[PDB]
Ligand binder design. Structure first.
Ligand SMILES: C[C@H]1CN(C(=O)Cn2cccn2)CCO1
Ligand SMILES: C[C@H]1CN(C(=O)Cn2cccn2)CCO1
Lengths: 304, 304
């Protein structure tokens, strides 16, 4: 029993983290096979960052200008290329700790683990969600860029995020490992405002299921609803619309608990309209939306 | 910016987790040097657990009855001993991945990371606190016993917890790595009720400091208080008494923010008496108490 905000074990990713230095900028790189992946803004002065022309800045950079340190040993850079907003530094040594891996681009509402690193060294691990506005709410200080987000699915480390930026509102923006930003964000120190940070409804419902499975049941009510009725209330509360695809995804949790998904929607509707009245669910005073239905099943079943 | 419930990177502990089987009970062991540490209840039938005599049950056990598997390779058990509520299984192979380590017994209010494991395989990592009633609020399914709690301090993995039990109220009890339970709990399937789960005041104050450092400042008020005045309100709200030792520990966060500790106490006092009024602090609708002052400094400074 018990339900925790749980990250994946980070060891497989720890073994991939290196330090990348260009001039006096140090940040983190990801070493898979004989490639090191890092934010292309490693090449920028903080002045460069106001309006960087990356292709022009890169002309001034040779392989020997990229210093890559794995622990306290230097890796030899034998090639570099820019792919979207990441650099790929080809090194002469394959990472001997390279796990089985994939690069995946996740959808808003999908969760992942972040291994926060500084100078290529792991400081901590936490669980994030890709917000509906394509920001994440991380914990990232200067030096943390190139820290990665990942899931460990089916004996494969799926890398989904690399840290690039903090917006003026202190939320975070980054890329997939092909260097494509999530959302409309750019690696430039300019006015970038995030859109509405809506609640990930399907994740809230998953977490209410987790709550019932762990004996937190006070919020279960005598009502049901329809997707259309529920969605009218969701819209009003800045919740994401629930689709039949979401209802299908919650099927296994519905089965396990015997609570129809639309009944749980009507319980969520009353929680929105009535509030928590000073009560908690799984030790939270607000409705948690950074657990996917897959996360709830995984944690409630003990997958390794 | 940003402040996350962050666990230590788990790789150093992942490399220590093994499977221990006695008859048809499988749980987790910790492999350091040539010793495997596991809950002594590995030897019990679920019937045994109602009133176990461990010394008597152990007479029936030989080295060859303890099956220890590290990945998919069997370790040879060449000795076993009971120390308090743990077994120490001496194996013929030193763990080649043994990190620098210490065994420490933590105090209530101290936080640590748990690597939840099943069949000796890591499933996830999360941050816990030793509650003032010497329980933890974990996430532990059948098979998770022998999962460990740890801190990584000063290039040393300090193991502080091994999972043994779930109480009927679904909170958790375990031992240090010398096999001594935290609190009054025993490894027997009997009525064990936890005491008052008080809020860890010094940790709440640390987290309010973290909130100010990360720009969440709405709760800062125009008042101060004294330890005695504050403690009268704390007592009423089931908060731990604040001591001058706690005030001293918060000194660096006071200095960094320029908010006197007693001013922050008076802000906390108003939050208790007035409530959150539907507002959040660092994305929480309740006052978080599972960050120590050391955790706030570490995360706000980027220690690796
Ligand atoms: C030779 C490498 C392989 N490693 C793995 O994690 C393999 N792996 C990935 C997913 C499942 N298993 C890390 C350390 O050394
Ligand atoms: C030979 C072992 C050593 N390991 C360490 O983590 C060492 N270490 C502990 C604290 C800081 N460093 C794990 C893998 O192989």
């Amino acid at each position: 029993s018990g339900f925790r905000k749980m990250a994946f074990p980070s060891g497989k990713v720890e073994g991939c983290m290196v330090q990348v230095t260009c001039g006096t900028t140090t940040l983190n790189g990801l070493w898979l096979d004989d490639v090191v992946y890092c934010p292309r803004h490693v090449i920028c002065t903080s002045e460069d960052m106001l309006n960087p022309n990356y292709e022009d800045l890169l002309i001034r950079k040779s392989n020997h200008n990229f210093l890559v340190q794995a622990g306290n040993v230097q890796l030899r850079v034998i090639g570099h290329s820019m792919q979207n907003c990441v650099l790929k530094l080809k090194v002469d040594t394959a990472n001997p700790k390279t796990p089985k891996y994939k690069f995946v681009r996740i959808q808003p509402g999908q969760t992942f683990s972040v291994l926060a690193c500084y100078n290529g060294s792991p400081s901590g691990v936490y669980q994030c969600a890709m917000r509906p506005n394509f920001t994440i709410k991380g914990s990232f200080l200067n030096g943390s860029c190139g820290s990665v987000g990942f899931n460990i699915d089916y004996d494969c480390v799926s890398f989904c995020y690399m840290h690039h930026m903090e917006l003026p509102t202190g939320v975070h923006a980054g890329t997939d490992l092909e260097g494509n930003f999530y959302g409309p964000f750019v690696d430039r120190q300019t006015a970038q405002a995030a859109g509405t940070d809506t609640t990930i409804t399907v994740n809230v419902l998953a977490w209410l299921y987790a709550a019932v499975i762990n004996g937190d049941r006070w919020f279960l009510n005598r009502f049901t609803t329809t997707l259309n009725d529920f969605n009218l209330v969701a819209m009003k509360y800045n919740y994401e619309p629930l689709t039949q695809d979401h209802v299908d995804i919650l099927g296994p949790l519905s089965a396990q608990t015997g609570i129809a998904v639309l009944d749980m929607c009507a319980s969520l509707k009353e929680l929105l309209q009535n509030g928590m009245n000073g009560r908690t669910i799984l030790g939270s005073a607000l409705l948690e939306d950074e657990f996917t239905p897959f996360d709830v099943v995984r944690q409630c079943s003990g997958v390794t």
